[model samples]
Target: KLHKEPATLIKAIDGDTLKLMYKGQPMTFRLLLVDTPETKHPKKGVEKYGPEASAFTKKMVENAKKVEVEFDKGQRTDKYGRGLAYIYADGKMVNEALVRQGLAKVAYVYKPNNTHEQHLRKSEAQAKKEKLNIWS
Candidate 1:
């Protein structure tokens, strides 16, 4: 994926969702790979370390002003009609951030590229080993 430039973080929708402004156009993106605790669905609540995931996300991009959209090896768009783009804010890729911060795991939802996959796996393992969030 091309290193598309980052944009400003307009507002965070929840634990892993956010509204971003790119080239003056507002886009809603979901962090790919790692799934955060369900803050949107209470039934899906009690998600492991849901609050911690949100906190990690908020701290990462709360004041950032740049983002990058990296395409995944899947159907681009999900059934919910949301454009699925791996998010990179500032110097960090939010999708991978979950694993790096121990808030999530490296979930491969589609064909694995084996490129960023290694880094993601390493991150997740490190997080789990450290007992950062959900692992805690």
Candidate 2:
């Protein structure tokens, strides 16, 4: 679902959430169905076990490269007015990749936009191999 959009400031908050310059505005693009550890909320720091998530995302999203985005049907606008989409950087599903790497959990925001639920679940299972976030 990679589509062209106004290239903006390319800043990686984590694997999925990125700050981009789009149409003369600075926007925060959060990948749908994925969430890396809190890196810059209270401060510019990663959470416990957040480094692995951050690194996994960086590899998938090209660190900080200017890239386009593709949003799901129900998630197009974030509360901050930034675009919310299923980020596919360089043809790889950044969301799914994060889940596969134990970097993020499965979809919890909505059921309608669960486009890759099966794939995400499978990935999550693999991620659980190490019990990084799925331990008892």
Candidate 3:
């Protein structure tokens, strides 16, 4: 279900996070129910497949004509101040797309926000069975 946020793509924070504009205000989001490889770290530098995941996210979100975001009712923001939400672009769920493409793994589930968890897990299972990208 698409939410009311008119998300404007500003930057790709990582595979599962983004910096965007919501209603003309700068907002950051951590995509719910998925985790990609780490693209950067102060100490670790980068993780395997991190760049690819970042690049994939960058291209997908930045290139989309429109972006939509829907937040979890129980918790809207995380400890880092990033909005916790599901993102949609091109009429598809971005979180599921990441898993479908094998660019991410199902993760970070919270009891209040497990709304789409089942669908996400199915996507991950398909990707894993097919051995796509990270699964390969």
Best of the candidates, lDDT: 3
The segments of candidate 3 whose C-alpha lies over 4 angstroms from its true place after superposition are 1-4
lDDT of prediction 3 = 0.86
List the candidates ranked by TM-score, beginning with the highest: 3, 1, 2
lDDT of 2 at 73: 60
Better of 1 and 2 by lDDT: 1
Question: On residues 13-128, what C-alpha lDDT tens digit does candidate 3 reach at each position?
Answer: 88888999987889889999898888675578788888888888888888899899988767889899999888988777888999999999999688988889999999999999
Question: What TM-score does candidate 3 get on C-alpha atoms?
Answer: 0.92
Against the true structure, what is each candidate's TM-score?
A: 0.80, 0.74, 0.92
* lDDT of every predicted structure (CA atoms): 0.71, 0.68, 0.86
What candidate 1 gets wrong by more than 4 Å, as runs, is 46-48, 112-115
Strongest candidate by TM-score = 3
* Candidates in order: C-alpha RMSD to true structure: 2.4, 3.6, 1.5
Error of 3 at 78 (Å): 0.3
**107, model 1: CA deviation in Å?**
2.2
